[PDB]
Design goal:
The chain is α+β, with helices and mostly antiparallel strands. The chain folds into two domains: 57 residues, Double Stranded RNA Binding Domain (2-Layer Sandwich); 94 residues, Ribosomal Protein S5, domain 2 (2-Layer Sandwich), CATH 3.30.230.10. Helix content is 31%, strand content 35%. The protein contains five helices and eight strands, in the order βββαββββαβααα. The strands form two sheets. A four-stranded antiparallel β-sheet has the order 1-2-3-4. The protein has a four-stranded mixed β-sheet with strand order 5-6-8-7. Helix 2 links the parallel strand 7 and strand 8. Helix 2 runs parallel beside helix 3. The longest helix is centred in the middle third of the chain and has 13 residues. 28% of the residues are buried. The structure holds magnesium ion (12 copies). The protein binds one RNA strand of 81 nucleotides through strand 1, strand 2, strand 7, helix 2 and strand 8. The PDB classes it as ribosome.
Amino acid sequence: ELQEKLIAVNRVSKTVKGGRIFSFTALTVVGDGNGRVGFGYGKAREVPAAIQKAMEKARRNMINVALNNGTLQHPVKGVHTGSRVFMQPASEGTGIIAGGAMRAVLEVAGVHNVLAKAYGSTNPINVVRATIDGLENMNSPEMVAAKRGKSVEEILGK
RNA sequence: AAAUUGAAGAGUUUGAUCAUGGCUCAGAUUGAACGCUGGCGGCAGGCCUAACACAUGCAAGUCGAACGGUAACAGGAUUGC
Ligand SMILES: [Mg+2]
Ligand SMILES: [Mg+2]
Ligand SMILES: [Mg+2]
Ligand SMILES: [Mg+2]
Ligand SMILES: [Mg+2]
Ligand SMILES: [Mg+2]
Ligand SMILES: [Mg+2]
Ligand SMILES: [Mg+2]
Ligand SMILES: [Mg+2]
Ligand SMILES: [Mg+2]
Ligand SMILES: [Mg+2]
Ligand SMILES: [Mg+2]
């Protein structure tokens, strides 16, 4: 029903008196392609087990993002701990031009044409969180017409 | 009416993580050089170094409608007619 993508897999380790204990962590993003996207971070010891955990976490905890026929309403700046994310609406036919982590988020969310850039740290989990944060706070022209006392015509047509 | 439509990251410090941070690569480009190989055509480019030294040929001559003229031949009658 909804598209799901695996972004990154990493092998983490912890130290016990017996020795080193290893595990695999998988970051995935899911979305219906119609303005809903969620990210999940699974953590297990076997790679197939971890990716399933990530999908389960990503399947819930979704967010709703307004899309203007496959592009953003206005340019936005997503910021998380270390990663600075700048996204910008683009014309028809430009495609998804973004980093490896950012491209997966925008594809499953339904964004087709967009210009994006990542500044600072490019750690995949931080980048996707910033992209999620940068899209959830984006407001549609109806929303700004709701906060202010003017109708859609006055907001843009005027 | 148009004169435009525009932005990607990855590797590497750790037992593992985040950040900082340098290093390195994926691109475009050249008056190119070298290695291997090599069919045709169009188009352009071709001493970036010693403003180092130069054999030899050529690259600035025209004007008898300025003038005295006749040295070569071209003619007419030794003769510039
Ligand atoms: Mg690592
Ligand atoms: Mg950095
Ligand atoms: Mg780092
Ligand atoms: Mg990492
Ligand atoms: Mg680095
Ligand atoms: Mg080392
Ligand atoms: Mg050669
Ligand atoms: Mg041929
Ligand atoms: Mg020279
Ligand atoms: Mg000289
Ligand atoms: Mg000549
Ligand atoms: Mg003579």
